[PDB]
Structure 1
Amino acid sequence: DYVPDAGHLVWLNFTPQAGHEQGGRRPALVLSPAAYNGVTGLMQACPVTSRAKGYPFEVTLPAHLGVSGVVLADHCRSLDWRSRRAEQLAEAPADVLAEVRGKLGSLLGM
């Protein structure tokens, strides 16, 4: 009965995807709250990749979480987290969630 909540890092399959969208099973930083995620079966989450290109939209995860890679803030997507088999991994610190949101917000024109 796990419902991802905002700030959770979950393992999720980003496949299926198209083109340059992130694919593959990897952590994902959940941005939407569990109340939405649980009522819809969807969530907004950003994939984490170990193939960091060092660009500013990549938000690094503190080593303490045990989740390698960077959050690709700009790659946030509406995801069916049951279909994509979300599995809880960890919880990101508030500052990572704030940085990802600020960067994604700038991308979305907020």
Structure 2
Amino acid sequence: DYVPDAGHLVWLNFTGRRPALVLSPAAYNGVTGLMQACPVTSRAKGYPFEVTLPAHLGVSGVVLADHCRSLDWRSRRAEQLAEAPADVLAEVRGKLGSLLGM
């Protein structure tokens, strides 16, 4: 009965494989079965679209703000891991929004 919400960090399966930061709100995610999410990676390079996660959340690394995509979280067995703070969400949205021309 879990529904991912904006700011959740979830494990998602791919063919639990990979963590991701949810950007879209639960209102959309629950209804559609889809969500917009950005991948978390351990491989931090100083790329300008990286957003560092704080230390004691349960997953380490950086969010790749420019790698957002629509994902079927139902089929991929989304499982909540942690929640990101508001500033991480704002930095991801601000950087992606810049790239998208918003």
User: What range is the shorter-chain TM-score in?
Assistant: over 0.9
Query: How far apart, CA to CA, are the structure 1 residues paired with 2:14 and 2:44?
Result: 17
Quote how far apart the aligned CAs of 1:66 are. Answer: 2.1
Query: How far apart, CA to CA, are the structure 2 residues paired with 1:101 and 1:37?
Result: 17
Quote how far apart the aligned CAs of 1:2 are. Answer: 0.3
Quote how far apart the aligned CAs of 1:13 are. Answer: 2.7
Which residue of the other structure, out of 98, 102, 105, is the alignment partner of 2:97?
105
Query: How far apart, CA to CA, are the structure 1 residues paired with 2:6 and 2:41?
Result: 19
Quote how far apart the aligned CAs of 1:14 are. Answer: 5.0
Measured against aligned partners, the alpha-carbon deviations of 1:45-93 in whole angstroms (never above 9, x if no partner) come to: 0000111222120100000212111100000000000111211000000
Q: What is aligned with 2:3?
A: 3
Contact 1:65 1:90 survives alignment (8 Å) = yes
Measured against aligned partners, the alpha-carbon deviations of 1:12-34 in whole angstroms (never above 9, x if no partner) come to: 1355xxxxxxxx92210000000
SS of structure 2 residue aligned to 1:64: coil
Query: How far apart, CA to CA, are the structure 1 residues paired with 2:71 and 2:59?
Result: 20
Query: How far apart, CA to CA, are the structure 1 residues paired with 2:8 and 2:19?
Result: 9
Structure 1 runs of 4+ aligned residues shifted over 3 Å read none
After TM superposition, the structure 1 = structure 2 runs for residues 59-74 of structure 1, keeping only pairs within 5 Å, are 59-74=51-66
SS of structure 1 residue aligned to 2:6: coil
